[PDB]
Amino acid sequence: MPHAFKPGDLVFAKMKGYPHWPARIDDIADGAVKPPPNKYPIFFFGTHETAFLGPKDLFPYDKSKDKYGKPNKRKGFNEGLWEIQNNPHASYS
């Protein structure tokens, strides 16, 4: 049975106006800006951007990849598909 989200979990993350996007739950570095309450720091593969999202916009990657893991014309999407499949826990700094 599922736990709450934790850093390193792989998801597709939804934001308004964008397709379900390959992403991970990040850690928060010591000294770094924390997210708002009940939100998680989401690192988006391919674009390498961070947004703060709650669980309603987070779809576990294993369950969802059939549906959402197909190429998309949007900038950075296909690079992101490669990253979540091939090296999802690397440094993208």
Swiss-Prot record:
Belongs to the HDGF family. Residues 7-64 form the PWWP domain. Acts as an epigenetic regulator of myogenesis in cooperation with DPF3a (isoform 2 of DPF3/BAF45C). Associates with the BAF complex via its interaction with DPF3a and HDGFL2-DPF3a activate myogenic genes by increasing chromatin accessibility through recruitment of SMARCA4/BRG1/BAF190A (ATPase subunit of the BAF complex) to myogenic gene promoters. Promotes the repair of DNA double-strand breaks (DSBs) through the homologous recombination pathway by facilitating the recruitment of the DNA endonuclease RBBP8 to the DSBs. It is found in: Nucleus; Cytoplasm. Interacts with HDGF. Interacts with trimethylated 'Lys-36' of histone H3 (H3K36me3). Interacts with trimethylated 'Lys-79' of histone H3 (H3K79me3), but has higher affinity for H3K36me3. Interacts with IWS1. Interacts with H2AX, POGZ, RBBP8 and CBX1. Interacts with histones H3K9me3, H3K27me3 and H3K36me2. Interacts with DPF3a (isoform 2 of DPF3/BAF45C). Interacts with SMARCA4/BRG1/BAF190A, SMARCC1/BAF155 and SMARCD1/BAF60A in a DPF3a-dependent manner. Widely expressed. High expression is found in heart, skeletal muscle, ovary and testis. Overexpression is frequently observed in hepatocellular carcinoma samples. This is Hepatoma-derived growth factor-related protein 2. It comes from Homo sapiens (Human). The lineage of its organism: Eukaryota, Metazoa, Chordata, Craniata, Vertebrata.
